[PDB]
Design an enzyme around this catalytic site. Structure first.
Site, short mmCIF file in Angstrom:
data_model
loop_
_atom_site.label_atom_id
_atom_site.label_comp_id
_atom_site.label_asym_id
_atom_site.label_seq_id
_atom_site.Cartn_x
_atom_site.Cartn_y
_atom_site.Cartn_z
CG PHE A 5 -2.11 0.93 1.09
CD1 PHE A 5 -3.17 0.62 0.26
CD2 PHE A 5 -2.17 2.11 1.82
CE1 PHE A 5 -4.26 1.47 0.15
CE2 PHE A 5 -3.25 2.96 1.72
CZ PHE A 5 -4.30 2.64 0.88
CG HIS A 18 -2.03 6.31 3.24
ND1 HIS A 18 -1.11 5.28 3.31
CD2 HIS A 18 -2.80 6.20 4.35
CE1 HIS A 18 -1.32 4.58 4.40
NE2 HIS A 18 -2.34 5.11 5.05
CG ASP A 30 -4.32 7.06 8.59
OD1 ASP A 30 -3.69 6.65 7.60
OD2 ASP A 30 -4.45 6.40 9.64
CG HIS A 62 1.17 5.89 7.44
ND1 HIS A 62 0.54 7.10 7.65
CD2 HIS A 62 0.19 4.95 7.43
CE1 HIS A 62 -0.76 6.90 7.76
NE2 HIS A 62 -1.00 5.61 7.63
C1 LIG Z 1 -2.67 -0.07 8.57
C2 LIG Z 1 -3.25 0.71 7.40
C3 LIG Z 1 -2.15 1.39 6.60
C4 LIG Z 1 -4.13 -0.19 6.50
N1 LIG Z 1 -4.71 0.60 5.42
C5 LIG Z 1 -5.82 1.31 5.64
O1 LIG Z 1 -6.55 1.14 6.61
C6 LIG Z 1 -6.12 2.42 4.63
C7 LIG Z 1 -5.04 3.48 4.80
S1 LIG Z 1 -5.09 4.30 6.41
N2 LIG Z 1 -7.43 2.99 4.89
C8 LIG Z 1 -8.41 2.99 4.00
O2 LIG Z 1 -8.33 2.41 2.92
C9 LIG Z 1 -9.65 3.75 4.39
C10 LIG Z 1 -10.85 2.85 4.65
C11 LIG Z 1 -12.09 3.64 5.07
C12 LIG Z 1 -13.28 2.71 5.38
N3 LIG Z 1 -13.61 1.82 4.25
C13 LIG Z 1 -14.49 3.55 5.76
O3 LIG Z 1 -15.48 3.61 5.06
O4 LIG Z 1 -14.34 4.19 6.88
C14 LIG Z 1 -3.34 -1.36 5.95
O5 LIG Z 1 -2.78 -2.16 6.67
O6 LIG Z 1 -3.33 -1.41 4.64
FE LIG Z 2 -2.96 4.85 7.11
#
Ligand SMILES: CC(C)[C@@H](NC(=O)[C@H](CS)NC(=O)CCC[C@H](N)C(=O)O)C(=O)O
Ligand SMILES: [Fe+3]
EC number: 1.21.3.1
Length: 330
Positions: free
Chosen positions: A210, A213, A215, A269
């Site tokens: 990933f 980005h 948050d 991150h």
């Molecule tokens: C630990 C994070 C970086 C995790 N990624 C994530 O959680 C990523 C980046 S923060 N977050 C998202 O895609 C947002 C999801 C929002 C959710 N569907 C909603 O409707 O509220 C990972 O492990 O990929």
């Molecule tokens: Fe994140």
């Protein structure tokens, strides 16, 4: 071309549940220090049973079938489900996409809820698997939502005090009847062979699951199993964030950066590619759809900021779409 390790302090947050005001200020100082450095810290003495969280999540991930995933799928994977933009199952694609997840929202979002009646964006009624096929799952998941909600409310008291505010400055907007906060239960699988299409290559050559980005949240309250993967950007490059499967990794989201004039940055991150079965279980601390916090600037004697107030619903809707556009549909 070596990779250094980030300083991620462990902060005993237990005083934030209590009435020792000086002890809470000493926690707030630690939150301030971390928020001004690399932005991440581990909350310890948080009072949540994260072993049970991990075990119940694993039982769910490892027993749900492809049939059940179609039935729970968000609109991006199932055109029949036009109302599921946020909540539901996020399918893997064997050979192409390894990650899969299940997202749920405020359990108080029911057909009775006025925001559901009004069809306000970002508000959805949770979808759940069959109780007899996943006994106790919905009960555990809903209970966990309120468990981590309680921890988050205490952490928000720490952030408010850290910024020189009264302890409810953020928490007063974080309410069970309207919070847009979400839980995501992410599975990162072990795969042999691992699909090359599921691996991205960063500009600096690092293989990623990933990309970089910030948050979309006020703060993010994250539990991960014991497999190192996260990196935080600094001026001298990305640094590894150590894993700790006994605590919660805390960081600010871009709404906090907005309202503090970037005094508390949303740390950038990314997720390293690691071929290992593991869990990533974030709780995104989101406010209400109409919540507005007046921006301020801690650097300035009078704290004045000419940044416009931003309604949280507008921020959330725009931010989640932008994150998909930039980093892909998860
Ligand atoms: C630990 C994070 C970086 C995790 N990624 C994530 O959680 C990523 C980046 S923060 N977050 C998202 O895609 C947002 C999801 C929002 C959710 N569907 C909603 O409707 O509220 C990972 O492990 O990929
Ligand atoms: Fe994140």
């Amino acid at each position: 071309g070596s990779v250094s390790k980030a300083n991620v302090p462990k902060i005993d947050v237990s005083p934030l549940f209590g009435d020792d005001q000086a002890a809470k200020m000493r926690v707030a100082q630690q939150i301030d220090a971390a928020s001004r450095d690399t932005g991440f810290f581990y909350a310890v003495n948080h009072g949540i049973n994260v072993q049970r969280l991990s075990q119940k999540t694993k039982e769910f991930h490892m027993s749900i079938t492809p049939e059940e995933k179609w039935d729970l799928a968000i609109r991006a994977y199932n055109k029949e489900h036009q109302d599921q933009v946020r909540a539901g199952y996020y399918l893997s694609i064997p050979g192409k996409k390894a990650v899969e997840s299940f997202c749920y929202l405020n359990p108080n979002f029911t057909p009775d809820h006025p925001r559901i009646q009004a069809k306000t964006p970002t508000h959805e009624v949770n979808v759940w698997p069959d109780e007899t096929k996943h006994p106790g799952f919905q009960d555990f998941a809903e209970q966990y939502y309120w468990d981590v909600f309680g921890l988050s409310s205490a952490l928000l008291k720490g952030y408010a005090l850290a910024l020189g505010k009264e302890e409810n400055f953020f928490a007063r907007h974080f309410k069970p009847d309207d919070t847009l906060a979400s839980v995501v239960l992410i599975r990162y699988p072990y795969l042999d062979p691992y699909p090359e299409a599921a691996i991205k290559t960063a500009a600096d050559g690092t293989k990623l699951s990933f990309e970089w980005h910030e948050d979309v949240s006020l703060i993010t309250v994250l539990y991960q199993s014991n497999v190192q993967n996260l990196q935080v950007e600094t001026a001298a490059g990305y640094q590894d964030i150590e894993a700790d499967d006994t605590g919660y990794l805390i960081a600010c989201g871009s709404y906090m950066a907005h309202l503090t004039n970037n005094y508390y940055k949303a740390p950038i991150h990314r997720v390293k590619w690691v071929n290992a079965e593991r869990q990533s279980l974030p709780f995104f601390v989101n406010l209400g759809y109409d919540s507005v916090i007046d921006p301020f600037d801690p650097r300035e004697p009078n704290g004045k900021s000419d940044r416009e107030p931003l309604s949280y619903g507008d921020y959330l809707q725009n931010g989640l779409v932008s994150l998909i556009n930039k980093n892909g549909q998860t």
